[PDB]
Subunit: 116 residues, 3 copies
Amino acid sequence: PAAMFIVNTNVPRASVPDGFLSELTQQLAQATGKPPQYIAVHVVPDQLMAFGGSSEPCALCSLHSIGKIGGAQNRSYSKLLCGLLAERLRISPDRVYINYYDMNAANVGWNNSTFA
Amino acid sequence: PAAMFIVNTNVPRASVPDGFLSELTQQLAQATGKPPQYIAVHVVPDQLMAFGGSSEPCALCSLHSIGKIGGAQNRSYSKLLCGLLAERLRISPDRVYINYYDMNAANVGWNNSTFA
Amino acid sequence: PAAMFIVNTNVPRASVPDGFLSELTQQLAQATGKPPQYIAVHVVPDQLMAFGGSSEPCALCSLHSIGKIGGAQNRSYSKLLCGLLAERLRISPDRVYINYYDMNAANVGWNNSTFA
Ligand SMILES: [Cl-]
Ligand SMILES: [Cl-]
Ligand SMILES: [Cl-]
Ligand SMILES: [Cl-]
Ligand SMILES: [Cl-]
Ligand SMILES: [Cl-]
Ligand SMILES: [Cl-]
Ligand SMILES: [Cl-]
Ligand SMILES: [Cl-]
Ligand SMILES: [Cl-]
Ligand SMILES: [Cl-]
Ligand SMILES: [Cl-]
Ligand code: NA
């Protein structure tokens, strides 16, 4: 029942709060209904990026999850995640993409095996 | 209207020309037929990479797009993008992979919703 | 004949042993049955990451492969790859996710074209 979230951004490392990974973990756990133990998070600052040809702060993100992905859920996650990026990283929400992936258990390895 | 392109390479940051992000944005807008406002680009130099076991210059790239992906289109994008990587970054085309992804609109979040 | 493996980890660059990229290339060629020429590897240390809310050593990885992906194969790759991350990088296997992707040939660009 793994899930993982990655944020790639041009904002500098010093502007990513030290608690941001834990905030994301906790908020995603609540949003997906998964124990936080199952959630992994990866933040990549200082990237060379443009969004719409401009290099104001932006983010390209991905959420890969075994289940809990779908049209309505994804609309809800986008509000959650845009809110977090807007407040903590000062990124305008119209400069964020989030790609959503519903992963089959057989296609997620963990602990020397897969979830299937 | 969304598309996003990432290039990961071992070539050094100093060898990425000024204007490269803008060139990628404009060339991708033209190639995909999408307005530049919704094209995002991400260039990641100085990576620890090998291609065929060799650490000569190489790249691993991804193009995620809502539509505009398919057999003939992807061949055209590959000629365009390998050409740019060869000309601008001096990477041989046979040391480049580009993964193409046709994203469902429901699976791309942007500005507090999805594109669905 | 293409496959590509990325490992993102918080472990420091200096802890990645000399030859790790070569070992990954060789072992992935053996495991997938593909010529080593077409195996690409990408190792990304020093990342800002958490797994289950802990920032102890962890990894998020992906294997994209034209074929050679499936239930039994992915279990085998996970045992191989988690074993390598444990032995070489000292990452507990229960702090690793590996996402597996079976790529269509038409969706992998290489050498100014695609594999389709
Ligand atoms: Cl804040
Ligand atoms: Cl899947
Ligand atoms: Cl535009
Ligand atoms: Cl086509
Ligand atoms: Cl080569
Ligand atoms: Cl999709
Ligand atoms: Cl094969
Ligand atoms: Cl850490
Ligand atoms: Cl192990
Ligand atoms: Cl753990
Ligand atoms: Cl595919
Ligand atoms: Cl040729
Ligand atoms: Na290699």
